[PDB]
Design a protein around this ligand. Structure first.
Ligand SMILES: [La+3]
Length: 16
């Protein structure tokens, strides 16, 4: 996770 929350969003997973 790149938000330090515990969940990866679409454009997020792209970075995770
Ligand atoms: La996140």
């Amino acid at each position: 996770d790149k938000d330090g929350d515990g969940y990866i969003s679409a454009a997020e997973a792209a970075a995770q």
